[PDB]
Amino acid sequence: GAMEDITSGLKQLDSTYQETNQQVLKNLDEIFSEMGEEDALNIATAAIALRGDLALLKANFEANELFFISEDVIFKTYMSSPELLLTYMKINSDKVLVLYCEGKLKIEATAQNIRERLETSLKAYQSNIGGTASLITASQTLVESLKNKNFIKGIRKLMLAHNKVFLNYLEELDALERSLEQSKRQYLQER
Numbered sequence: 001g002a003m004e005d006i007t008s009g010l011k012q013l014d015s016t017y018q019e020t021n022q023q024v025l026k027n028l029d030e031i032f033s034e035m036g037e038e039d040a041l042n043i044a045t046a047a048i049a050l051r052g053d054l055a056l057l058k059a060n061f062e063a064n065e066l067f068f069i070s071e072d073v074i075f076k077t078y079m080s081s082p083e084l085l086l087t088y089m090k091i092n093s094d095k096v097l098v099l100y101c102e103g104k105l106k107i108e109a110t111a112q113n114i115r116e117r118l119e120t121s122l123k124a125y126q127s128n129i130g131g132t133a134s135l136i137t138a139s140q141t142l143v144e145s146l147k148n149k150n151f152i153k154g155i156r157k158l159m160l161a162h163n164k165v166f167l168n169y170l171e172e173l174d175a176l177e178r179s180l181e182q183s184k185r186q187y188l189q190e191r
């Protein structure tokens, strides 16, 4: 649904990245065939950011997109309802209370894995976003600066969407814990 949107956002950003990188390497090849010197240095600096910090941004977005795939599998299956969670615990005081024990434990473990992923992603963005300044500094005209700034705004928008996705997982797990406890109460009441 909204994940086609995010996948697409990523493909667009990647395309702009490849083209920015192509343009920069072409420019370096031409340069190395005082205002011009400062510009050449700004461009080499951009080439470095593109290979380094910004490649790390790209890898981060990619790891997230893959995860959104596999974790989506998890949430559409054994994590999709209390009944199916309990069943999953069964295949892998009372004999059913313990099953709920296992289910709640699995929810907790899932939330923890999601938090660790989100933390890693937030850290990668925080550490690498600063490298985008160099694309602004290397711009030779206000038009080029505008295009680079749009690219950067796009990077931030994609990041805002990914954070929404992670937090949405956590919220779903919270609702599911509520429901699992309500179902557990209802079960005990019927036994």
Ligand SMILES: [Cl-]
Pocket: 111, 115, 170
């Ligand atoms: Cl949480």
